[PDB]
Amino acid sequence: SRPTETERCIESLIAVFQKYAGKDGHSVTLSKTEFLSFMNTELAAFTKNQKDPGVLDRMMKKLDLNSDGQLDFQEFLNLIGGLAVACHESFVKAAPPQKRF
Amino acid sequence: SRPTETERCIESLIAVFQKYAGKDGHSVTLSKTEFLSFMNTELAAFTKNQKDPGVLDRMMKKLDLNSDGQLDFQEFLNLIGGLAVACHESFVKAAPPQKRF
Predict the structure, then answer these.
(1) Is there a contact between B28 and A82 if contact means CB atoms under 8 Å apart?
(2) Fold of B1-101
(3) Which residues of B touch A14 (CB under 8 A)?
(4) Positive or negative CA dihedral for B72, B4, B45, B84?
């Protein structure tokens, strides 16, 4: 597999992490702060003017950082993935009258 | 944001789940079995001829299913995401001489 919709799907989220987590191959982790810039630089639709300080702020905080001292592989998928569920489809635009704290 | 590399990245993994987890909007979950077909139908590069029964088999089993009785949002990102780390970049093609059980 290569040109498969899913194929491009996987490589997509893995790299969002790798990009900040290493441009020339360094380690299998990243940085809580390095994630900051990425979100605001390549994910404004999720944190546009911080219209919602409960999507990103809640994820990055609850991500529980303690893996090798640095970020991680799923931590990112978890970091951004969670936002997708708290900003993109899956959960949002599905239960407008069923949303609360 | 819309045409951003990350933008397409998020929508990519969310839909892999949604697609099996509902084509016309049903719920925010999926099905352990429904995931089976998806992997073999749109992710053979990860389970091609089951060359590696430790990537998918270990993920789907350890995913710990007990959310609303059905699958879930991250469960998929976790299911496929984990594979990306156990088959795609992030972890693989990074430590050839540093891999083991």
Answers:
(1) no
(2) Recoverin; domain 1 (1.10.238)
(3) 84-85, 88-90
(4) negative
